[PDB]
Write a protein that binds this ligand. Structure first.
Ligand SMILES: Nc1ncnc2c1ncn2[C@@H]1O[C@H](COP(=O)(O)OP(=O)(O)OP(=O)(O)O)[C@@H](O)[C@H]1O
Ligand SMILES: [Mn+2]
Ligand SMILES: [Mn+2]
Ligand SMILES: [Mn+2]
Ligand SMILES: [Zn+2]
Ligand SMILES: [Zn+2]
Lengths: 263, 49, 56, 56, 42, 114, 30, 147, 56, 391, 65, 117, 162
RNA sequence: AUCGAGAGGG
DNA sequence: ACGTCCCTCTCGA
């Protein structure tokens, strides 16, 4: 068919599951690894504040906004503020946002991710939207106000890779395993009387097989077939966060050649 | 959650700390230094508090 | 070789008793015929607190 | 207490012996008692040893 | 803050955790400073 | 305070050629590229792919320190056949392999649907 | 029923009461 | 510190992708060195963690109060049936390589605490500078910036 | 014992000390902010002048 | 700061973050650590003074201490704790990983050496790989109990022309000892030659470790096998060896030993029955722990940990000692308003039978406390006793 | 001091699921470790994020202005 | 250069000893029955419960066919005794006893032990 | 407590649990007593009521039922701070003496009026966290309601040797 | 600024 | 008669 072949296990809204057959560990690792922090996404970066009577400090809430997930589907259509041409930022490099909230409610009154609003040119690209996974659809509780507390701040939302800060974290947790029955002896165990009946079979041992004790160890046993499960907060769909995992890597290797043939 | 106890004197919350002491108006006796001309002694802390 | 001697003999002694709280009491830490036995020596003083002829 | 000494054959051996350990110190005349080893008796009082047997 | 409100400056063996001390001072809450177990924490 | 800037974990500084080749001073037919602003994502894999190359002898890499993002890769090959040429191939093998994942996931993805 | 003794967690409820009447800075108010 | 006279500053800082992980993809928040428990024998550091890894999966507050017939095995009894290793260990995978670690690693949520010592509050340098008036020598302390 | 047999000194430093497997025995990882304030008289000599004028 | 080895000179290496950073193996001579310790730094304002600090107060120059005429620095913690993991002949390296080790040695000769398995599984051994950091020109011979020219346990150490012949590295061969690899190399090869060796070994050793890994859990202090089943009787039979002398001493039959009182003979003969009780109760565990225990593997290298720490952790803490002798009767001829009067038991004169794993009772817990305090008094209070001696 | 956005350990959006956790344990009245488990948290890293949170913001608001 | 030994032995005793990766092995010969031989031999690759050689071919660097045997290796000789010879495989030691092969064997770091069956 | 033939009992347990729905209940009922350190001489107390009457921690015995009183819970000898150690009955006595005056050098929610109170210097934490490891004593020292640290997922092992 | 007292840090 | 070395804070005439 090709080379490093694959077969999904499951697929879903937030998670995806797959065995990478005929892939090299150094690869499945290095892929895993770039998936974490090296795929671009958007997230609030600067934030100026006009009025904040809340209990939480200004930069308190500051740090909190940077961590709200933004839509990033089409994102390569935005180019890194730092690498663009406009005295600071523009619409070519940044989505801008604004949040008015005032404690009119005599109860205790909430501000969410929903409550955000975009006050720049979208230029017709899927960007800047604060994902809502929420059941109630009401977003992420940012703050709380007693009838009379106000909040006026606005948020310049630029493109970043987690390598610089977690907030530009497209990923979340990434499940990783391989060779369930330790057939490659890649890890000495730890037991009091029996190793076996104390270390529990992982939930993957059924797609590989038991080892027929009687038989010996094979010293040509190589690493192949890897059990992974990736998950994205939502900033990016989960197919794109795996495939623009692959993509980024290619580009990474790529610019080797690129500056190779310069010298 | 504040539980009191403290004075507020020109602003800074100062505290008072238990100053212990061997009770007064009591009696005890303690053999004393080998080279003293005294073998034991009887002490009453005489002070009406 | 002077101020050198002093630290070679003094050093040990301070950490013969700056490190007895590692266990929980036991023995010859820093309050048993040791660091103080030295207290005697350098000062001389006659009132030795455990004299003893060992006679063959 | 064991004390090493040469077994005639030439080597050193393990022939012990007794010793009377004291809780006071007047060597000045526990030197001269008979049936000890005045040439060996030892007392911690490096200050008495100084007066009895010589600075050196 | 509590632990400051229940502190007993014992002016100046007396430093040791004593048998009488059961149920009044803390077994092992005192300072590793130049007045260890001198100030006792009720 | 003495914190360096995070953006230096990638964005190459003033006139700092990304790759940099020197010749292994005492091992014959050998090189030490100093990859800048990169990490084990790259390293481990360039190298490991090299460990397939027919006429290539040595292939392994260190991180002279975790404060910095540079890492040296040292490669030596058969008489004639070129080290540089070796990295070359090993890189394409990579992206060709990656390419097949790209589409092999999307094929599988473009199946089940929830 | 009032004729049954006292366990561990029984004494907790006691202590619980102890502070409700006296608190934690007793001696120092008092 | 943790709650066991278990101090130490920060040696270096690393990122999820570079740091070891468990199969379910959980990363250590912090990493202490085994070489600081034989010397002291802080076994409740050990169990606090082992209990609290139950506290976690269980949803129910973990009891550390002292004179309690709550056996160690008492805890690990549950620990096994929640899923993970009976004694808290877990097969760990080298962050840098993807390879596993021939040694499994003991892993749970021990409560820790920030203390009031920041390096940036402590650092200080001086080369010529403010000068006392009777002794003519340097001056005392980071405050007054001196020697 | 305070202002002669000991004094304080210009050109001195301080900070938390951490430890480094990727370092050599005989060197010490001093931070910038000390190196920016830690000076050092150096004379103008033809062997360095082409250096000092780039530091200035 | 009470000695030369604690005011050594260094080369600078300007770096980020606000913290002085120094090589793990110059810890000791300063007795410093990485949990809150500041450190000073000076800087000569001249040239001659630099020379004075370079050619006299250097770090490699003071590699061997005059005071104790032995090397005052050496391999420690992670390096030492796993350098013996590596110098096993159970310990094998495969093709890939080896080069990564080779490269790391900054003075490598770039020759891939003759592996120790060839074909039915090309494979290298730790003692093999290690030796490239050991300067081809070194001979060393150390024997201990059981060490033959065909050493079965991997005991002692023989390395000729700077390559491991047999034996395990550990505190003895590598550490700061007298007949020690550091003491060898610093002598015949030169202060600074040695130096690099610190590096060459720290670098290559650490690498191997983070790929074999090494931790430690309560699992490395539970031996509740029949072992704790038999450690429970020595805690019993040794109450008999003090239960005998109990009413026997209160029947006057107690032989007033030459000198000491009858009272004092009872203590000094029971504490010999309790100490040897505590001791020879955990040395029943020191063999239940397979060679694949970690804290075993941590004292078996001598990286951290002593025996006592095991029996206090797994078997039984032991008799807790105020002022030298057992506990006291600060009450009425007794120890605790929970205990008989005029009572000389062990179960309340301070013998904490339970272990750290198990968990003291409030009694046992209390007496532990009293004991360490004087301990804590020994360190903060009476630490100025020899600080005075020194001035 | 309010719920923090997602998880310290793997950084998964958990700011949201707070108010939804409350009614699960209250309105529906159920087990703690069943309320989190049924909000999609199987990693005890995230789980530790919710279960050990004190919402002192509430004491805050309760103040005069 | 050439084959510098060829005697044939088999299983006398087998031992790990808190080991499990390697086993040293005791054995005396059967085609020349007046010698003993003790060999630290890896058991992951070749176990036992059978010939042997020495050779030195079929300085200078090392490349990824003498492979007619099965288990192979390479050690060094470090001290020889007399009536016995001792080789080290970077940790794996090996001793054999005799008086004949004075002509073939010689004290070198040379050594490519072999086995089969 | 007080012993005859132990006064307080599951009657007097419930006797107050409606409360949050009396110490002077237990003293004037003659169920309890205030014994200074001098009157401690003339009395006998069993550590645990149940324990002393007729593979876990190998436990103390009872013996001569001459018992005047009984100890409420042993745990109350602890101090104001140390009360927060997770299982000090498994730790070396000098360590406990450190965690003790080390939780006094910490960071956390020191009051709740931190915002309108303004004093010289003061730290507050960003996301306080009730410890997953709790001792009964905490309840009374109002801890979980103003924690001091955060349940760090932690793993111990060697790595970078940093 | 200076002297005096106080809590912590290795 | 002196009574271990250094260091960081905070506060009253
Ligand atoms: N009172 C003191 N006087 C002199 N030096 C001290 C004193 N207290 C600590 N130090 C120095 O601090 C170092 C050890 O103290 P520290 O408490 O850090 O030891 P530690 O072993 O880390 O603590 P822990 O014992 O809990 O592990 C030594 O170099 C010692 O000289
Ligand atoms: Mn300390
Ligand atoms: Mn320390
Ligand atoms: Mn320290
Ligand atoms: Zn722009
Ligand atoms: Zn999480």
């Amino acid at each position: 068919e090709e080379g490093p072949q694959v077969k999904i296990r499951e697929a879903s809204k937030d998670n995806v599951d797959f065995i990478l057959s005929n892939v090299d560990l150094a690869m499945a690792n290095s892929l895993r690894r770039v998936m974490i922090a090296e795929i671009p996404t958007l997230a609030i970066d600067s934030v100026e504040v006009e009025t904040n009577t809340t209990v939480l400090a200004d930069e308190f809430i500051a740090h909190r906004l940077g961590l709200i997930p933004l839509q990033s589907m089409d994102i390569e259509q935005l180019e890194y503020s730092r690498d663009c041409f406009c005295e600071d930022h523009c619409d070519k490099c940044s989505v801008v946002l604004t949040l008015q909230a005032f404690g009119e409610s005599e109860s205790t009154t909430n501000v969410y991710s929903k409550d955000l609003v975009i006050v720049s040119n979208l230029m017709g690209r899927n960007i800047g939207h604060p994902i809502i996974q929420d059941k109630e659809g009401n977003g992420v509780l940012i703050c709380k106000l007693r009838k009379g507390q106000e909040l006026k701040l606005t948020c310049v939302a630029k493109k970043g890779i987690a390598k610089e800060h977690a907030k530009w974290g497209p990923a979340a947790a990434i499940e990783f395993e391989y060779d369930p029955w330790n057939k490659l002896k890649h890890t000495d165990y730890w037991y009091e009387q029996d190793s076996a009946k104390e270390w529990p079979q992982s939930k993957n041992c059924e797609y590989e097989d038991p080892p027929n004790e009687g038989d010996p160890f094979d010293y040509k046993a190589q690493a192949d077939t890897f059990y992974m499960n990736v998950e994205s907060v939502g900033s990016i769909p989960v197919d794109q966060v795996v495939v623009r995992g692959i993509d980024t890597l290619q580009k990474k290797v790529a610019s080797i050649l690129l500056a190779l043939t310069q010298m | 959650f504040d539980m009191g106890g403290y004075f507020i004197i020109n602003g800074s919350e100062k505290v008072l700390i238990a100053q212990e002491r061997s009770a007064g108006n009591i009696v005890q006796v303690f053999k004393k230094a080998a080279p003293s001309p005294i073998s034991h002694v009887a002490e009453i802390r005489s002070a009406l508090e | 070789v002077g101020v050198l001697a002093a630290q070679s003999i003094g050093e040990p002694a301070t950490q013969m008793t700056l490190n007895t709280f590692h266990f929980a009491g036991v023995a010859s830490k820093k309050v048993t015929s040791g660091v103080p036995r030295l207290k005697e020596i350098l000062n001389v003083a006659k009132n030795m607190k455990t004299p003893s002829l060992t006679v063959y | 207490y064991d004390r090493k000494v040469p077994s005639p054959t030439g080597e050193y051996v393990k022939e012990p012996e007794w010793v009377l350990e004291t809780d006071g110190v007047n060597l000045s005349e526990v030197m001269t008692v008979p049936g000890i080893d005045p040439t060996r008796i030892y007392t911690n009082s490096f200050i008495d040893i100084m007066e009895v047997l010589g600075i050196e | 803050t509590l632990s400051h409100l229940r502190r007993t400056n014992t002016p100046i063996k007396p430093r040791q955790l004593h048998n009488t001390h059961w149920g009044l001072v803390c077994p092992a809450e005192t300072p590793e400073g130049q007045a260890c177990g001198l100030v006792k924490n009720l | 305070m003495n914190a360096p800037d995070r953006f230096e974990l990638f964005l190459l500084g003033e006139g700092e050629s990304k790759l940099k080749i020197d010749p292994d001073t005492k091992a014959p037919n050998a090189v030490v590229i100093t990859f800048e602003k990169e990490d084990h994502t790259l390293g481990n894999l360039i190298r490991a792919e090299l460990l397939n190359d027919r006429k290539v002898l040595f292939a392994a890499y260190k991180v002279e320190h975790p404060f910095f993002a540079r890492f040296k890769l040292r490669i030596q090959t058969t008489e004639g056949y070129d080290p540089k040429d070796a990295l070359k191939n090993a890189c394409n093998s990579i992206i060709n392999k990656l390419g097949a994942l790209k589409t092999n996931f999307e094929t599988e993805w473009n199946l089940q649907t929830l | 029923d009032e004729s049954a003794p006292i366990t561990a967690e029984d004494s907790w409820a006691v202590i619980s009461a102890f502070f409700r009447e006296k608190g934690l800075v007793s001696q120092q108010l008092d | 510190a943790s709650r066991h006279g278990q101090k130490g500053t920060i040696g270096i800082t690393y990122r999820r992708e570079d740091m070891p992980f468990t199969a379910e993809g959980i990363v250590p928040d912090l990493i202490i060195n085994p070489h600081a428990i034989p010397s002291r024998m802080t076994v409740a550091h050990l169990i606090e963690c082992l209990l609290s890894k139950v506290a976690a999966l269980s949803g129910n507050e973990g009891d550390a109060s002292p004179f309690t017939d709550i056996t160690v095995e008492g805890i690990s009894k549950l620990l096994r049936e929640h899923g993970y290793q009976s004694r808290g260990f877990e097969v760990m995978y080298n962050g840098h390589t993807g390879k596993k670690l021939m040694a499994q690693i003991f892993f749970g949520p021990t409560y820790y605490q920030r203390l009031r010592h920041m390096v940036d509050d402590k650092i200080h340098a001086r080369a010529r500078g403010p000068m006392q008036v009777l002794t003519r020598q340097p001056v005392e302390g980071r405050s007054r910036d001196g020697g | 014992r305070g202002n002669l047999m000991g004094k304080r000194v210009d050109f001195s430093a301080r900070t938390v000390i951490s430890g480094d497997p990727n370092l050599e025995l005989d060197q010490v990882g001093v931070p910038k902010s000390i190196a920016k304030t830690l000076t050092y008289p150096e004379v103008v000599t033809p062997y360095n002048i082409d250096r000092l004028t780039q530091l200035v | 700061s009470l000695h030369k080895m604690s005011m050594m000179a260094h080369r600078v290496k300007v770096i980020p973050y606000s913290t002085f950073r120094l090589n793990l193996s110059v810890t000791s001579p300063y007795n410093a650590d990485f949990d809150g310790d500041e450190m000073n730094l000076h800087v000569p304002q001249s040239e001659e003074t630099r020379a004075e600090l370079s050619q006299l107060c250097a770090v490699p120059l003071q590699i061997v201490s005059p005071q104790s005429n032995k090397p005052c620095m050496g391999i420690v913690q992670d390096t030492l704790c796993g350098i013996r993991k590596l110098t096993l002949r159970d310990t094998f390296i495969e093709l890939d990983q080896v080069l990564n080790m080779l490269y790391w040695v900054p003075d490598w000769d770039g020759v891939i050496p003759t592996p120790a398995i060839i074909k039915p599984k090309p494979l290298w051994s730790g003692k093999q790989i290690l030796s490239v950091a050991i300067p081809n020109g070194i001979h060393l011979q150390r024997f201990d109990e059981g060490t033959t020219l065909l050493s079965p346990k991997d005991n002692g150490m023989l390395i000729i022309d700077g390559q491991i012949i047999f034996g395990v590295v550990e505190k003895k061969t590598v550490g700061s000892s007298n007949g020690g690899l550091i003491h060898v190399v610093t002598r015949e090869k030169g202060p600074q030659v040695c130096a690099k060796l610190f590096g060459n070994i720290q670098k290559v050793v650490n690498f191997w470790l983070l790929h074999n890994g090494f931790s430690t859990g309560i699992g490395d202090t539970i031996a509740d096998g029949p072992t704790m089943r038999e450690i429970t009787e020595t805690i019993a039979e040794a109450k008999k060896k003090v239960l005998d002398v109990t009413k026997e001493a209160q029947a006057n039959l107690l032989t007033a030993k030459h000198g000491m009182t009858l009272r004092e003979s009872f203590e000094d003969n029971v504490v010999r029955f309790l100490n040897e009780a505590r001791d020879k109760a955990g040395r029943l565990a020191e063999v239940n722990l397979k060679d694949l225990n970690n804290v075993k593997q941590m004292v078996m290298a001598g990286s951290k940990g002593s025996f006592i720490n095991i029996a206090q952790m797994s078997a039984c803490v032991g008799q807790q000692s105020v002022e030298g002798k057992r506990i006291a009767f600060g009450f009425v001829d007794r120890t605790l308003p929970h205990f008989s009067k005029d009572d000389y038991s062990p179960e309340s004169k301070g013998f904490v039978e339970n272990s750290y794993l198990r968990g003291l009772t409030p009694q046992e817990f209390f007496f532990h406390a009293m004991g360490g305090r004087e301990g804590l008094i020994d360190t903060a209070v009476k630490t100025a006793e020899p600080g005075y001696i020194q001035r | 001091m309010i719920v923090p956005v997602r998880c310290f350990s793997c950084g998964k959006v958990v700011g949201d699921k707070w108010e939804s956790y409350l009614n699960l344990l209250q309105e529906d009245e159920l087990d703690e470790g069943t309320a989190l488990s049924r909000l999609g948290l199987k990693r005890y890293c995230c789980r530790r994020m919710i279960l050990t949170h004190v919402d002192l913001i509430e004491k805050f608001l309760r103040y005069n202005p | 250069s050439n084959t510098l030994f060829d005697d044939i032995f088999q299983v006398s005793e087998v031992d790990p000893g808190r080991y499990n990766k390697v086993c040293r092995i005791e054995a005396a010969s059967t085609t020349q029955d007046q010698c003993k031989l003790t060999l630290d031999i890896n058991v992951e690759l070749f176990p036992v419960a059978l010939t042997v050689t020495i050779a030195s071919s079929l300085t200078r660097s090392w490349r990824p066919l003498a492979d007619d045997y099965d288990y192979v290796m390479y050690g060094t000789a470090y001290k020889f005794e007399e009536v016995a010879v001792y080789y080290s495989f970077g940790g794996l030691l090996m001793r054999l006893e005799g008086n004949y092969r004075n002509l073939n064997n010689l004290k070198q770091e040379n050594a490519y032990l072999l086995i089969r069956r | 407590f007080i012993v005859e033939d132990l006064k307080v009992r599951k009657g007097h347990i419930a006797k107050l649990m409606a409360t949050e729905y009396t110490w002077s209940s237990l003293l004037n009922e003659g169920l309890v007593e205030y014994i200074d350190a001098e009157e401690e001489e003339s009395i006998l107390i069993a550590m645990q009521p149940e324990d002393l009457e007729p593979a876990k921690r190998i436990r103390v015995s009872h013996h001569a039922t001459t018992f005047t009183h009984c100890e409420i819970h042993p745990s109350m000898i602890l101090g104001v701070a140390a009360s927060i150690i997770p299982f000090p009955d498994h730790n070396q006595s000098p360590r406990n003496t450190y965690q003790s005056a080390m939780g006094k050098q910490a960071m956390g929610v020191f009051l709740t009026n931190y915002n309108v109170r303004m004093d010289t210097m003061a730290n507050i934490l960003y996301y306080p966290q009730k410890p997953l490891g709790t001792t009964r004593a905490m309840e009374y020292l109002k801890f979980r309601e103003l924690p001091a640290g955060q349940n760090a997922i932690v793993a111990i092992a060697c790595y970078s040797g940093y």
